[PDB]
Scaffold this motif. Structure first.
Motif, PDB file in Angstrom:
ATOM      1  N   UNK A 168     -12.849  15.816   4.140  1.00  0.00           N
ATOM      2  CA  UNK A 168     -13.998  14.940   4.311  1.00  0.00           C
ATOM      3  C   UNK A 168     -13.893  14.231   5.641  1.00  0.00           C
ATOM      4  N   UNK A 169     -15.006  14.174   6.364  1.00  0.00           N
ATOM      5  CA  UNK A 169     -15.128  13.289   7.517  1.00  0.00           C
ATOM      6  C   UNK A 169     -15.867  12.029   7.075  1.00  0.00           C
ATOM      7  N   UNK A 170     -15.121  11.147   6.416  1.00  0.00           N
ATOM      8  CA  UNK A 170     -15.745   9.974   5.824  1.00  0.00           C
ATOM      9  C   UNK A 170     -16.084   8.940   6.879  1.00  0.00           C
ATOM     10  N   UNK A 171     -15.083   8.240   7.397  1.00  0.00           N
ATOM     11  CA  UNK A 171     -15.372   7.132   8.289  1.00  0.00           C
ATOM     12  C   UNK A 171     -14.679   7.353   9.614  1.00  0.00           C
ATOM     13  N   UNK A 172     -15.247   6.732  10.634  1.00  0.00           N
ATOM     14  CA  UNK A 172     -15.216   7.284  11.973  1.00  0.00           C
ATOM     15  C   UNK A 172     -13.872   7.169  12.669  1.00  0.00           C
ATOM     16  N   UNK A 173     -13.352   5.972  12.853  1.00  0.00           N
ATOM     17  CA  UNK A 173     -12.071   5.866  13.524  1.00  0.00           C
ATOM     18  C   UNK A 173     -10.945   6.124  12.533  1.00  0.00           C
ATOM     19  N   UNK A 174      -9.726   5.816  12.960  1.00  0.00           N
ATOM     20  CA  UNK A 174      -8.535   6.270  12.256  1.00  0.00           C
ATOM     21  C   UNK A 174      -8.348   5.590  10.905  1.00  0.00           C
ATOM     22  N   UNK A 175      -8.028   6.409   9.900  1.00  0.00           N
ATOM     23  CA  UNK A 175      -7.740   5.931   8.556  1.00  0.00           C
ATOM     24  C   UNK A 175      -6.493   5.065   8.588  1.00  0.00           C
ATOM     25  N   UNK A 176      -6.408   4.108   7.675  1.00  0.00           N
ATOM     26  CA  UNK A 176      -5.237   3.258   7.638  1.00  0.00           C
ATOM     27  C   UNK A 176      -4.597   3.087   6.283  1.00  0.00           C
ATOM     28  N   UNK A 177      -5.336   3.121   5.183  1.00  0.00           N
ATOM     29  CA  UNK A 177      -4.655   3.041   3.901  1.00  0.00           C
ATOM     30  C   UNK A 177      -5.396   3.822   2.834  1.00  0.00           C
ATOM     31  N   UNK A 178      -4.618   4.324   1.881  1.00  0.00           N
ATOM     32  CA  UNK A 178      -5.162   4.961   0.698  1.00  0.00           C
ATOM     33  C   UNK A 178      -4.515   4.341  -0.515  1.00  0.00           C
ATOM     34  N   UNK A 179      -5.183   4.483  -1.649  1.00  0.00           N
ATOM     35  CA  UNK A 179      -4.579   4.166  -2.929  1.00  0.00           C
ATOM     36  C   UNK A 179      -5.328   4.890  -4.025  1.00  0.00           C
ATOM     37  N   UNK A 180      -4.789   4.790  -5.227  1.00  0.00           N
ATOM     38  CA  UNK A 180      -5.403   5.459  -6.355  1.00  0.00           C
ATOM     39  C   UNK A 180      -5.431   4.523  -7.542  1.00  0.00           C
ATOM     40  N   UNK A 181      -6.250   4.882  -8.513  1.00  0.00           N
ATOM     41  CA  UNK A 181      -6.137   4.313  -9.837  1.00  0.00           C
ATOM     42  C   UNK A 181      -5.018   5.069 -10.538  1.00  0.00           C
ATOM     43  N   UNK A 182      -4.630   4.646 -11.735  1.00  0.00           N
ATOM     44  CA  UNK A 182      -3.465   5.281 -12.335  1.00  0.00           C
ATOM     45  C   UNK A 182      -3.807   6.631 -12.955  1.00  0.00           C
ATOM     46  N   UNK A 183      -4.772   6.677 -13.871  1.00  0.00           N
ATOM     47  CA  UNK A 183      -5.018   7.951 -14.531  1.00  0.00           C
ATOM     48  C   UNK A 183      -5.881   8.888 -13.696  1.00  0.00           C
ATOM     49  N   UNK A 184      -6.029   8.616 -12.398  1.00  0.00           N
ATOM     50  CA  UNK A 184      -6.518   9.574 -11.412  1.00  0.00           C
ATOM     51  C   UNK A 184      -7.957  10.007 -11.673  1.00  0.00           C
ATOM     52  N   UNK A 185      -8.857   9.046 -11.531  1.00  0.00           N
ATOM     53  CA  UNK A 185     -10.270   9.354 -11.450  1.00  0.00           C
ATOM     54  C   UNK A 185     -10.903   8.880 -10.159  1.00  0.00           C
ATOM     55  N   UNK A 186     -10.459   7.756  -9.621  1.00  0.00           N
ATOM     56  CA  UNK A 186     -11.002   7.246  -8.378  1.00  0.00           C
ATOM     57  C   UNK A 186      -9.881   7.136  -7.363  1.00  0.00           C
ATOM     58  N   UNK A 187     -10.159   7.503  -6.122  1.00  0.00           N
ATOM     59  CA  UNK A 187      -9.226   7.295  -5.025  1.00  0.00           C
ATOM     60  C   UNK A 187      -9.945   6.504  -3.956  1.00  0.00           C
ATOM     61  N   UNK A 188      -9.309   5.455  -3.481  1.00  0.00           N
ATOM     62  CA  UNK A 188      -9.942   4.565  -2.536  1.00  0.00           C
ATOM     63  C   UNK A 188      -9.311   4.762  -1.175  1.00  0.00           C
ATOM     64  N   UNK A 189     -10.152   4.880  -0.154  1.00  0.00           N
ATOM     65  CA  UNK A 189      -9.687   5.021   1.215  1.00  0.00           C
ATOM     66  C   UNK A 189     -10.283   3.917   2.056  1.00  0.00           C
ATOM     67  N   UNK A 190      -9.537   3.470   3.059  1.00  0.00           N
ATOM     68  CA  UNK A 190      -9.964   2.338   3.868  1.00  0.00           C
ATOM     69  C   UNK A 190      -9.499   2.497   5.300  1.00  0.00           C
ATOM     70  N   UNK A 191     -10.442   2.365   6.225  1.00  0.00           N
ATOM     71  CA  UNK A 191     -10.204   2.680   7.617  1.00  0.00           C
ATOM     72  C   UNK A 191      -9.882   1.478   8.469  1.00  0.00           C
ATOM     73  N   UNK A 192     -10.067   1.654   9.778  1.00  0.00           N
ATOM     74  CA  UNK A 192      -9.998   0.555  10.733  1.00  0.00           C
ATOM     75  C   UNK A 192     -11.376   0.104  11.169  1.00  0.00           C
ATOM     76  N   UNK A 193     -12.426   0.807  10.783  1.00  0.00           N
ATOM     77  CA  UNK A 193     -13.770   0.344  11.079  1.00  0.00           C
ATOM     78  C   UNK A 193     -14.398  -0.369   9.912  1.00  0.00           C
TER      79      UNK A 193
END
Lengths: 50, 228, 430, 152, 56, 162, 50, 60, 123, 51
Positions: free
Chosen positions: C165-190
């Motif tokens: 996926x080309x989600x958000x524009x500049x460099x990615x900085x953190x990821x995390x997940x929920x426990x039973x693996x349905x949602x994954x959250x990504x967060x950039x520098x923009x």
């Protein structure tokens, strides 16, 4: 000891030039290049011998 | 034709002959270990090479207080091929003894052959990392030499410090920067190492780089002070 | 339970939870440390360091024990982040633009060797690098956020990418997940957060991934994410360089009303005021600026040349005396006016100069109360102590240490009052 | 209290009156000397049989577990149904805890000041428990175990 | 070899070279403290056949 | 594509259906089929990296790695082709005659050609060659099977009569 | 080929004589020589002679 | 003037005097080494934050 | 798959080592065969040593690391002899190779890069 | 040490005097050296003995 080291360097130089010339006589397809500094050398074709 | 000159330390002699040389009074005469030569003056005297022996790089590097003497007991962690450790047996002479340890088995066989010939060396052929297996046979060493390339030199030497070191004792470590880290500068890595030993109770005194013999090796000389 | 921290130095510091000390410096054996993560069952922590190498330090048998256990097989690229799967696999992302899969398994001859290398399609006018790796348990996948701005789902068997996926524009900085693996959250520098889902039956049955939603909530840029999902509440906390904290809900990331936890929380006072000569005085990191007012003008500055801790607890009583205290030493001054200038002089005593002070107040100009870091109350007169009634250590006091320490104290003219967070308020006459 | 020593001339158990506070006094006194050696000197030394095969099997099963001569010490290691001994080794403490005697031995605690103390001390037992220069016995034992450990 | 050595061996060594020189005590104690290879049966029989040939 | 990207475009639309990717550098790739039932069949994409990591993906469901394996030897791989059934050069004309390919050919950089049986290669999963041709002295660039599965034509690109 | 042999032989000869020379020789060392102490006044008062 | 007394702040603060060939630096204080985690790496943290705020993205 | 042969390469290093082998064969700057490798090692002009990791029996290559350590030259394992053979350009299964000295190359840079990589691996 | 040395040296080992004289004087190298006393070379003959 310094003299001996310098003599060794000279000898290995002459041995390497003679060794390349000796390998220049066996087989393959040779290709002559001039390295634009002024060196003369060779390059073989991509050709695995049997 | 050749004259002697005694050194600051005992057993160490500089032979002034056709060329100056670093030499030690032999224990037994007319017997080689690694194809070195000899010189007599009758007394028989054996060379070291400052290349092939790191402590030889230390002595002609110049170290004030090396804690070797004739009548004492030294530990040697890292006696591969037995050369410098048989030479240390030479310099402690008859009365003192060395306990050498080693793990790889080809220098294991080489050192145990030198142990067959020479008595004052007692060999232990283990991994150094668990000193119980040789506290069954070693008791209360005086001084310690450590040339092990593993990066946790501080952990292994603090372990043998708590187990065997004589109080107010003497310890010498060797450091290869291009083996512990291999990217950054010599005195930097050295300061970090002696910080480790300082927190691990070893009070250092000096260190010295072995420039025209080794590629960025140094040696750290320190003491064990009021510690157990 | 313990708390390990990696600074920009070359050590880990396992902190001292009951006191707030560095309980142990463990120096790593290999150079500058970049990142850390600990295995499942909290058994073995692992650090990735710029020499190109992965160090395994195992922790077992209480706190303080930090012994070198293993080096991994090393390579010339600086390791940027790590994540454990089980006791078996360390996944690491590094600035060769690529992700290596190292084996840490007991009783198998492949212990120590990196056994997979997967690669990222690079940028153009840069030198891109992988910023974060996270392991997804249920569908046996790994996710990586990388500096081209992309989110890539590899799957861990056969080491091969399933989704990009080309989600958000500049460099990615953190990821995390929920426990039973349905949602994954990504967060950039923009300043953008994107939520990626699997939760429907069809996306489960194909194990696809589809980016559900996005949102921007921050001021400058986003630096860290963490998730939690339990029967009391279901929320993630995001921390942003716009120096503040935000809180969102996991079931309702498009819906839940966010909360902005503010810049300064005043649980640490930095300033004090007194009516003797109309003073306000502010202590900062190693600096004490004063003003007098009535308009105003500044007075002093204490760039304490000796030590380098943040000035924790400061005080000035009526008159011109100054206490300032650290958990390491103290520092006590006599102050003096001349007008637009003031003058400060340092006192001298070994007891104050060694001892550690959490909190301190004035009774008079002369006798003050010293709250030690070890829960001990001294009185000093300008070495007289007082007993303290013990509180019970419970099982929670065994798990979490610092609940029993003295949190606050107030002293008026005569009677002081002492408070520890277990729920004890206690009265002292001194 | 009991104190174990695995001497390079034998195997010995000693008595000691109470542990940890005694270790505090020991490290602050440097009780490594002949004074404290005489103070808690002897309970029972057992010199090993001068047979390098029995010695090799001995220290092999010492690095591995408890020994048969160690059980010959264990026949009267005890005076109370749990009688705490000081060993210098984790697995050996655990072995003598989980085999047939089942009673208490202090684990690998701070008592290495203690063991290095009696290690400085046992030279002053040179006519006491085994009456010779024991370092020669050490040299023989080490060559035997090395020639067994490496194949040769 | 330096192992199968006993009191009657020392006595017959006294009937041989001597014991009164003390060499018997020296060889038995150096036989206790010796570190060279305990030679096997075949090196043993070969140095035996060698010595017998030399004595003949 | 670029590095491990094979892209897949629906033809008579011009649409982008799906893209899969391996690592290293994709040198080559080809197509095989597998019938299942009366007119239902799955297509398998086969891709060779330079090092000899054969990937086999399928394309009925979206890009899900069936399996990988590594060719024996294989320093420089520079063409793959399947054969013995239907392919890109001997295609079927109606859905019933789609037949599973049997022989699999990997032509290397030397001139070597490793040659596998699929029916047991798929099983043993790091398999041995059925055989190893070693005739030529230069690179390979054309490998083509018969229509019926007997004849393997191999062809260089660097010297005459090769 | 025989010429390459002869030159190689003399080169090894000179190499071995150089190694025996470097083994029998003796150089001099010059490396970083640091010394620790505990007081800064005693440090500033340090003298190698003293 | 005060510039040279800034440099003499450096002089009173520094810990290394060379004596020709030789060099002496002393042992840092136990309470500092034990009750501070050591200093950060200027070069590495500068590198990472430079990589963040390069000119290649038009931040600000 | 051969636990006696210790310092063993991974995938990426495997690829780059065999590529630099390919350029070596195209420039005639390397010697093949274990015996000639030991020859050029005693003569000490070898840049570095590649060994195969699945030659049965394993000692035929294992006689090398002794001298490699004694002259301090780096050596590295690759896990298929047939692969190294086709990389060097000879039909038979090669098990050993050495890259020789030529500072007039155009492969100088890659040689030095892979040399330091093998070195830091070998520490 | 005999293991450390390579194969062509092992074909030589004996006739080192003839070797070094022949290489210093640029003549033909010797072939058998010491391996003449093997049963296999006793079976062979001539140029076959060289091979």
């Amino acid at each position: 000891v310094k003299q001996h080291l310098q003599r060794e360097t000279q000898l290995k130089q002459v041995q390497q030039r003679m060794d390349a010339q000796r390998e220049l006589l066996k087989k393959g397809s040779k290709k002559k290049i001039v390295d634009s500094s002024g060196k003369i050398s060779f390059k073989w074709k991509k050709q695995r011998k049997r | 034709k050749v004259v002697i000159e005694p050194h600051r330390h005992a057993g160490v002699y500089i032979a002034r002959g056709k060329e100056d040389l670093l030499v030690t009074k032999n224990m037994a005469p007319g017997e080689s270990v690694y194809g070195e030569k000899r010189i007599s003056v009758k007394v028989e005297y054996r060379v070291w090479n400052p290349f092939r022996s790191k402590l030889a790089a230390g002595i002609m590097g110049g170290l004030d207080e090396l804690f070797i003497a004739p009548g004492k007991k030294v530990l040697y962690l890292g006696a591969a091929s037995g050369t410098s450790v048989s030479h240390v047996s030479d310099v402690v002479g008859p009365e003192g003894v060395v306990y050498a340890v080693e793990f790889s088995h080809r220098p294991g066989r080489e050192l145990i052959s030198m142990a067959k010939k020479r008595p004052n060396i007692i060999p232990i052929i283990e991994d150094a990392r668990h000193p119980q297996k040789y506290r069954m046979l070693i008791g209360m060493v005086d001084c310690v030499f450590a040339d092990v390339a593993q990066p946790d030199q501080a952990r292994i030497i603090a372990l043998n410090s708590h187990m065997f070191l004589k109080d107010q004792g003497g310890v010498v470590i060797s450091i290869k920067a291009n083996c512990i880290d291999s990217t950054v500068d010599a005195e930097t890595v050295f300061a970090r190492e002696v910080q480790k030993l300082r927190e691990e109770r070893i009070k250092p005194l000096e260190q010295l780089t072995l420039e025209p013999y080794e590629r960025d090796h140094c040696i750290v000389v320190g003491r064990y002070m009021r510690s157990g | 339970l313990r708390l390990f921290s990696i600074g920009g130095s070359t050590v880990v510091t396992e902190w001292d939870l009951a006191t707030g000390l560095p309980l142990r410096n463990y120096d790593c054996n290999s150079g500058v440390i970049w990142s850390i993560s600990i295995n499942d069952s909290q058994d073995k922590l692992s650090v990735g360091c710029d020499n190109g190498t992965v160090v395994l330090i195992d922790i077992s048998g209480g706190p303080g024990v930090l012994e070198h256990d293993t080096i991994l097989m090393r390579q010339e690229a600086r390791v940027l982040t790590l994540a454990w799967k089980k006791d078996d696999f360390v996944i690491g992302g590094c600035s060769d633009g690529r992700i290596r899969i190292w084996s840490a398994q007991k009783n198998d001859e492949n212990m120590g060797r990196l056994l997979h290398t997967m690669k990222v399609d690079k940028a153009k006018k840069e030198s891109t690098l992988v910023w974060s790796v996270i392991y997804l348990p249920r569908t046996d996948q790994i996710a990586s956020g990388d500096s081209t701005g992309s989110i890539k789902f590899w799957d861990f068997q056969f080491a091969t990418l399933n989704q990009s996926f080309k989600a958000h524009d500049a460099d990615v900085l953190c990821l995390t997940t929920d426990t039973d693996n349905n949602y994954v959250f990504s967060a950039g520098v923009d300043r953008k957060i994107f939520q990626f889902s699997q939760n429907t039956n069809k996306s489960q049955k194909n194990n696809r991934w589809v980016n559900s939603s996005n949102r921007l909530l921050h001021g400058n840029d986003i630096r860290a994410i963490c998730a939690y999902q339990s029967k009391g509440a279901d929320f993630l906390v995001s921390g942003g360089v716009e120096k503040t904290l935000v809180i969102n809900s996991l079931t309702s990331f498009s819906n839940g009303n966010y909360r902005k936890m503010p810049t300064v929380e005043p649980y640490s006072k930095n300033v004090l005021v007194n009516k003797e000569q109309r003073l306000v005085v502010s202590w900062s990191e190693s600096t004490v600026k004063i003003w007098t007012m009535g308009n105003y003008k500044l007075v002093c500055k204490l760039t304490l040349k000796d030590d380098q801790n943040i000035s924790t607890c400061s005080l000035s009583p009526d008159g011109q005396v100054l206490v300032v205290g650290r958990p390491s030493t103290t520092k006590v001054f006599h102050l003096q006016p001349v007008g637009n200038k003031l003058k400060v002089t340092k006192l001298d005593n070994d007891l104050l100069l060694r001892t550690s002070t959490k909190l301190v107040k004035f009774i008079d100009n002369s006798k003050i109360v010293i709250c030690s870091c070890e829960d001990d109350v001294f009185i000093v007169d300008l070495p007289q102590e007082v007993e303290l009634l013990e509180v019970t250590s419970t099982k929670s006091s065994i798990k979490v240490p610092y609940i029993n320490r003295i949190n606050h104290l107030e002293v008026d003219q005569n009677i002081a009052v002492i408070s520890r967070g277990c729920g004890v308020v206690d009265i002292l006459d001194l | 209290a009991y104190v174990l020593t695995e001497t390079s001339a034998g195997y010995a158990l000693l008595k000691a009156s109470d542990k940890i506070y005694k270790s505090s006094s020991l490290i602050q006194d440097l009780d490594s000397s002949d004074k404290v050696l005489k103070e808690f000197k002897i309970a029972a030394f057992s010199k090993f049989n001068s047979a390098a095969n029995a010695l090799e099997e001995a220290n092999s099963i010492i690095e591995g577990k408890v020994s048969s001569q160690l059980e010959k010490l264990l026949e009267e290691i005890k005076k109370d149904k749990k009688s705490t001994l000081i060993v210098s080794e984790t697995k050996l403490a655990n072995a003598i805890n989980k085999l047939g005697l089942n009673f208490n031995v202090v684990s690998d605690a701070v008592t290495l000041d203690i063991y290095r103390a009696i290690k400085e001390y046992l030279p002053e037992l040179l006519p006491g428990m085994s009456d010779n220069d024991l370092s020669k016995m050490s040299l023989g034992l080490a060559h035997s175990i090395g020639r067994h450990k490496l194949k040769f | 070899d330096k192992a199968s050595l006993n009191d009657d061996s020392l006595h017959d060594l006294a009937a041989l070279l001597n014991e009164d020189s003390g060499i018997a005590q020296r060889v038995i104690d150096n036989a206790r403290i010796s570190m060279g290879q305990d030679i096997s049966e075949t090196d043993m029989e070969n140095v035996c056949v060698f010595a017998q040939r030399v004595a003949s | 594509g670029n590095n491990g990207w094979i892209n897949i475009l629906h033809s008579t639309s011009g649409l982008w259906l799906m893209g899969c990717k391996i690592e290293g550098v994709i040198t080559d790739f080809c197509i095989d089929y597998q019938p299942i039932s009366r007119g239902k069949f799955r297509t398998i994409l086969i891709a060779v990296n330079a090092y000899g990591e054969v990937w086999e993906f399928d394309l009925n469901k979206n890009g899900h790695v069936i399996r990988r394996w590594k060719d024996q030897g294989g320093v420089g791989i520079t063409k793959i082709q399947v054969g013995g059934g239907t392919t890109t050069t001997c295609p079927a004309l109606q859905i019933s005659k789609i037949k599973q390919n049997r022989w699999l050919a990997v032509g290397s950089e030397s001139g070597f050609v490793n040659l596998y049986d699929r029916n047991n290669a798929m099983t043993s999963s790091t398999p041995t060659p059925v055989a190893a041709l070693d005739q030529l002295t230069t690179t390979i660039s054309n490998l083509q099977f018969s229509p019926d599965g007997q004849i393997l034509c191999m062809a260089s690109r660097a010297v005459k009569d090769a | 080929t025989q010429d390459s042999n002869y030159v190689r032989t003399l080169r090894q000869i000179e190499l071995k004589k150089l190694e025996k020379g470097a083994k029998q020789l003796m150089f001099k060392s010059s490396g970083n020589h640091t010394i620790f102490v505990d007081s800064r006044e005693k440090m500033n008062e340090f003298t190698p002679e003293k | 003037i005060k510039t040279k007394k800034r440099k003499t702040l450096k002089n009173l603060r520094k810990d290394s005097v060379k004596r020709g060939k030789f060099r002496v630096q002393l042992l840092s204080t136990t309470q500092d080494s034990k009750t501070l985690p050591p200093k950060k790496e200027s070069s590495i943290i500068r590198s990472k934050d430079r990589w963040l705020n390069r000119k290649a993205l038009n931040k600000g | 798959p051969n636990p006696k042969a210790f310092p063993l390469a991974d995938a990426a290093l495997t690829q780059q080592i065999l590529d630099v082998v390919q350029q070596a064969a195209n420039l005639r700057q390397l010697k093949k065969g274990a015996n000639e490798a030991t020859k050029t090692l005693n003569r000490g002009i070898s840049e570095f040593i590649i060994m195969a990791a699945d030659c049965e029996p394993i000692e035929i290559l294992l006689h090398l690391p002794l001298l490699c350590e004694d002259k301090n030259v780096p050596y590295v394992f690759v896990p298929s002899r047939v692969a190294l053979g086709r990389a060097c350009g000879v039909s038979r299964p090669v098990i050993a190779a050495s890259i020789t000295t030529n500072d007039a190359s155009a492969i100088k840079t890659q040689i030095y890069a892979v040399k330091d990589k093998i070195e830091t691996l070998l520490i | 040490s005999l293991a450390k040395s390579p194969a062509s040296t092992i074909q030589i080992l004996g006739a080192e005097k003839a070797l070094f004289r022949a290489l210093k004087t640029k003549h033909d190298t010797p072939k058998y050296g010491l391996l003449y006393h093997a049963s296999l070379v006793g079976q062979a003959t001539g140029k076959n003995k060289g091979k």
